[PDB]
Swiss-Prot record, chain A:
This is Chaperone protein ClpB. Part of a stress-induced multi-chaperone system, it is involved in the recovery of the cell from heat-induced damage, in cooperation with DnaK, DnaJ and GrpE. Acts before DnaK, in the processing of protein aggregates. Protein binding stimulates the ATPase activity; ATP hydrolysis unfolds the denatured protein aggregates, which probably helps expose new hydrophobic binding sites on the surface of ClpB-bound aggregates, contributing to the solubilization and refolding of denatured protein aggregates by DnaK. Homohexamer. The oligomerization is ATP-dependent. Changing residue 93 to A: Decrease in ability to disaggregate proteins due to decreased substrate-binding activity. Retains hexameric quaternary structure and ATPase activity.
From Swiss-Prot, chain B:
The keyword rRNA-binding does not apply. ATP 2 binds at residues 320-327. One of its GO terms (cellular component) is cytosol. Changing residue 96 to A: Decrease in ability to disaggregate proteins due to decreased substrate-binding activity. Retains hexameric quaternary structure and ATPase activity. Residues 1-182 are annotated as: NBD1. It comes from Escherichia coli (strain K12). This is Chaperone protein ClpB. The Clp repeat (R) domain probably functions as a substrate-discriminating domain, recruiting aggregated proteins to the ClpB hexamer and/or stabilizing bound proteins. The NBD2 domain is responsible for oligomerization, whereas the NBD1 domain stabilizes the hexamer probably in an ATP-dependent manner. The movement of the coiled-coil domain is essential for ClpB ability to rescue proteins from an aggregated state, probably by pulling apart large aggregated proteins, which are bound between the coiled-coils motifs of adjacent ClpB subunits in the functional hexamer.
Curated annotation (Swiss-Prot), chain C:
One peptide binds per ClpB hexamer; the binding site is formed only upon ATP-driven oligomerization. The Clp repeat (R) domain probably functions as a substrate-discriminating domain, recruiting aggregated proteins to the ClpB hexamer and/or stabilizing bound proteins. The NBD2 domain is responsible for oligomerization, whereas the NBD1 domain stabilizes the hexamer probably in an ATP-dependent manner. The movement of the coiled-coil domain is essential for ClpB ability to rescue proteins from an aggregated state, probably by pulling apart large aggregated proteins, which are bound between the coiled-coils motifs of adjacent ClpB subunits in the functional hexamer. It comes from Escherichia coli (strain K12). This is Chaperone protein ClpB. Homohexamer. The oligomerization is ATP-dependent. Belongs to the ClpA/ClpB family. Induction: By heat shock and other environmental stresses. It is found in: Cytoplasm. Part of a stress-induced multi-chaperone system, it is involved in the recovery of the cell from heat-induced damage, in cooperation with DnaK, DnaJ and GrpE. Acts before DnaK, in the processing of protein aggregates. Protein binding stimulates the ATPase activity; ATP hydrolysis unfolds the denatured protein aggregates, which probably helps expose new hydrophobic binding sites on the surface of ClpB-bound aggregates, contributing to the solubilization and refolding of denatured protein aggregates by DnaK. The gene is clpB.
Length: 568, 573, 91
């Protein structure tokens, strides 16, 4: 026949017990049996994003036909999995696909309506050459064929809803993606098959950790595909750890290994203030506020519909604004430059706002994405830095209203960007003169009140109502910026060790470097670039001059007005 | 058995020693054994490259099966390969190849989990059997995948996987991407040390280990079509057959690195490089002797080996007006270092003043004007990793370039918006500017070169970043030439004119007085050498081509370019 | 005309056949480099287009061959002119 060539008998495979114990999905099998028992249009199409187990639903339907959990219109049926990829194989000659397809339809008609057909990837029927829709389509309309289709939602609305006739011949049985507990029940149903295949043991905290962590930390796949992937890959890794040269129980540590590759952080976050003062000295209040935000987010108490950090940095520039934020992105998730910096001096127009959100449909910057939205859609776990937010056009803060209240922002191309795993940081200088001229012997709370009054005279009442906490950034004294210069000398010594040199200094040279470009009105960054220029010009010039040798004592001795490098 | 008819056994050929021993690739075989010992997504497909040992991993897996180094689950498994044209031997009837293949698949199902089948060129098996009223191979094996009756192992390229296996659904969810990286230089050394004894016992010659490491390094440096380690194996075996011919035709057996150089150039460095550099500069880039010394110092400090090899050699910002030898210097560096005239990339920064600067030049995330075209810089260096990079007219740049340029000036390697790494450590990055060129045209006369360079570096510190110009090797001052250098460059242009006329069949020698009339009538201090070019064109070629077509100047005579009162006339004698 | 390659292409991965191939670079890049079932049975002997002077030598030998057919006297300026002008003007 032609059914033997192109179809796979799923009820014969269920009779041989080769299918899976499909546990769950009972409403969708009831809905499919509601569609497969009509008089015309007996054709359910299963619809859901890939991985949600639609072939699993049809395998469960075949097992219920075998056992007898179906009504008296489905006992003794045969579920035959038709292969659309196997009929369009020899597509050379005229009328070579139509003879195959007509042979399958005549053999399904010979069985007197006793065969349910199953076409997975039903969108392959539309593009087959006219071809495959137009021959099935009269038999589908009159209920003479019981085609259980199965296709992805996006492929369905791209290929089948485009064609209103073939869309009429099918009924949508929406296969929704399962919850976390349902994945746990599936994996407890499928645990015995893996433990009798791999011949290992599986522990139930590893199962619930697989379901929870794949649900939480993977946005590509969907449950229960990714959870079964984690369990099977971990079981194979334990199988090769046994069978090479020693546990057999899969643990949640194995699940974390497979998730990270393919909870001492609590004790780290208890000393998160120490970690933030490892790299930025001074400014205890901002470190306390940011660490409070991190502790509230990681402890599970904060609002899950708001971003983690929503703060307004004030004060003069270069006092440790971006150094704190780079250290925060380093010790939060990954790295110093695993963050997003946006120079808000660029944005002073209306098309500036359309740049940082995205141009609407039909205009120039449409396909190019947004600016903020692309940077967060690429890095959903990152830190956002709005550098000098006072320079922005006064309607960027409406975009920021949506950002800081909801954690969502819809770009020009109509897709939502989730900000609920990031930290928004806005640096400004709206009260630099007022805090620099009144830093002396004034407290923190009244200074916050005064600069908050000034900022409230600057900003809109809706926007300052959204901010979580407004820190002050008091100016640093001479010893604070001197200690900053000491830390910069330490990281410069680290960079010289990376270059491969051991260079010492005198304390008089340290005082001259600390007093080259010291200015409280411009920050430590003029002092930083003064030290960096006055070291990287003469020392690296003497490197190119052929003087420095790796493995010699090099002291930064002082000149009358300069610093000389010696070779001892 | 139909297996004994037209299949190929790898375990038998590994047990009988007919297969090459495989050394290395333990991580890839380990991940392949991770993939094979699953219950879902059983079948691996080895995504690799044409010539990186995709067949070698399955050969080494068969050797570990025969040697018993495998885990207990894979012991006793007979790895077979599948041969197409062997199965299309005597099958011309109506469905005879399909019947033979169906019998092979029924015999593989009869083995019941015993045969781990290897299918090289898996996409080719998907698209093989263009038959007459019958089936192909891929859609007759495809029901045997999703019935648990096949333990396939595949091999393909990344592009053929992305086209022919990622597009399908069940073909995607039966297969795993065991990605096979291209091996390193020392990996190639280890592999060539593995198979040296077989080639020596075949070709009756001897192979030396410095020749092996030289073959590996020069194959990694020079050859771009093939890849490691197959190109190095081809070099070794081609040198072996060359030594065998030298025995046969007209008495050595030791393959040295000189033999490898003979084969490879047929397919002493630093000092001669310095001499050829400083000699071929004055052939092409005449004048600018301070610049010749500056470029010579830069090349000595680069190829001395005392600097950092994690940085690109080209790190330069240039100064001077149009037509001062900048492009001449770029093409001279290309013709010297890379053995080709057009061995460079010429892009001008005069038009990237907007936000489409990094996305046009460097690399575009999906949606830009430079996205459906490839890319201007990173994709061009993907085309030419052995080349020179030019950034002309840098005074019209954009601030989201300087960060990319600091990445080049610090580390060289560069990741564009698409997420691929393009390295610049074998390229020569060149930038040109013309801001301080007014003082150079103004007062180069009666002044020196060092104080001029210091004052124009002060002007750069007025205009540009003092920290961005630190990683630049040397910023040059291009000035001036009055009589003898004008005579030399006019002699160059006259040389190419003499080449065209001698291909026509004429012999023209310029007189000194006519060249003085060209130097007076063609040169001016305000412009440079372009009025010399158009004056050469007009005052020489237009009356000369007026005269040649006139039936006047007979071939084969010395044509002295004499002078008129103000013109330049050609004479016959 | 199964016709020839399914009785020859097996013998290439059988050692009984020692064939010598000749094809265009484009037909090689289409019909052989894709056909990876036979790729390590070949080596790309890239016959470069000859230069002008190699063509002049080829034309001197074939001058000696061609003058006995047309019964004329091909001249050596005609050889060097044909090489130079055919290299320039016929792309
Ligand atoms: N309710 C369920 N009971 C048992 N196994 C399930 C269930 N849902 C999913 N699975 C398993 O999850 C995996 C998903 O396979 P599929 O059914 O192909 O997934 P899908 O939802 O059909 O999406 P695609 O496009 O087919 S990958 C299989 O191994 C199924 O056995
Ligand atoms: N410094 C120089 N020394 C000697 N000859 C020079 C010098 N600068 C220019 N020339 C000559 O003048 C010509 C001017 O052409 P180019 O240098 O190519 O002009 P350009 O400014 O580089 O722009 P293009 O795109 O190359 S036309 C050169 O080809 C040389 O023949
Ligand atoms: N480590 C190795 N040990 C033995 N042989 C090797 C090794 N690496 C490469 N080879 C040889 O180089 C060839 C290249 O293999 P492969 O990349 O599979 O070619 P292709 O990609 O064209 O199928 C192999 O046939 C093998 O004989
Ligand atoms: Mg499916």
């Amino acid at each position: 026949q032609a059914l033997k060539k192109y179809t796979i008998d799923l009820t014969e495979r269920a009779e041989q017990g080769k299918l899976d114990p499909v546990i769950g999905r009972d409403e969708e099998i009831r809905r499919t049996i509601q569609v497969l028992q009509r008089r015309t249009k007996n054709n359910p199409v299963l619809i859901g994003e890939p991985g949600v187990g639609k072939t699993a639903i049809v395998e469960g339907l075949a097992q219920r036909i075998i056992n007898g959990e179906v009504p008296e219109g489905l006992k003794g049926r045969r579920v035959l999995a038709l292969d659309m990829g196997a009929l369009v194989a020899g597509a050379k000659y005229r009328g070579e696909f139509e003879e195959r397809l007509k042979g399958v339809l005549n053999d399904l008609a010979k069985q007197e309506g006793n065969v349910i057909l199953f076409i997975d990837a039903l969108h392959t029927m539309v593009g087959a050459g006219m071809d495959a829709g137009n021959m099935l389509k009269p038999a589908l309309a009159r209920g003479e064929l019981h085609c259980v289709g199965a296709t992805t939602l996006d492929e369905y609305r791209q290929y089948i809803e485009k064609d209103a006739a073939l869309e009429r011949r099918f009924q949508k049985v929406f296969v929704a993606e399962p919850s976390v507990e349902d994945t746990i029940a599936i994996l407890r149903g499928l645990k015995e098959r893996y433990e009798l295949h791999h011949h290992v043991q599986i522990t139930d905290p590893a199962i619930v950790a697989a379901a929870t962590l794949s649900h939480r930390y993977i946005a590509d796949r969907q449950l229960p595909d990714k959870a079964i992937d984690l369990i099977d890959e971990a079981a194979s890794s334990i199988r090769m750890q046994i069978d090479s040269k020693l546990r057999n129980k899969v643990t949640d540590a194995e699940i974390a290994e497979v998730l990270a590759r393919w909870e001492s952080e609590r004790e780290k976050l208890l000393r998160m203030e120490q970690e933030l003062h490892h790299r930025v000295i001074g400014q205890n209040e901002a470190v306390d506020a940011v660490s409070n935000a991190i502790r509230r987010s990681r402890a599970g108490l904060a609002d899950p519909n708001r971003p983690i950090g929503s703060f307004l940095f004030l004060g003069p520039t270069g006092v440790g604004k971006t150094e704190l934020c780079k250290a925060l992105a380093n010790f939060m998730f990954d790295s110093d430059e695993a963050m997003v910096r946006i120079d808000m001096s660029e944005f002073m127009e209306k098309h500036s706002v359309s740049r940082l959100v995205g141009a609407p449909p039909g205009y120039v910057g449409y396909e190019e994405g947004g600016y903020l939205t692309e940077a967060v859609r690429r890095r959903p776990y990152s830190v956002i830095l709005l550098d000098a937010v006072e320079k922005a056009h006064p309607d960027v803060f409406n975009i920021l209203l949506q950002v800081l209240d909801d954690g969502r922002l819809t770009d020009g191309q109509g897709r939502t960007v989730d900000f609920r795993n990031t930290v928004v940081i806005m640096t400004s200088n709206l009260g630099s003169d007022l805090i620099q001229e009144r830093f002396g012997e004034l407290d923190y709370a009244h200074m916050k009140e005064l600069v908050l009054g000034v900022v409230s005279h600057n900003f809109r009442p809706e926007f300052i109502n959204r901010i979580d906490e407004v820190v002050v950034f008091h100016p640093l004294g001479e010893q604070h910026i001197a200690s900053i210069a000491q830390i910069q000398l330490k990281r410069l010594y680290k960079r010289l060790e990376e270059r491969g040199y051991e260079i010492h200094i005198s304390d008089e040279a340290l005082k001259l470097l600390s007093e080259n470009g010291y200015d409280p009105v411009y920050g430590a960054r003029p002092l930083k670039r003064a030290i960096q220029q006055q070291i990287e010009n003469p020392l690296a010039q003497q490197i190119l001059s052929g003087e420095l040798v790796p493995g010699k004592v090099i002291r930064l001795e002082v000149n009358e007005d300069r610093i000389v490098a010696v070779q001892h």
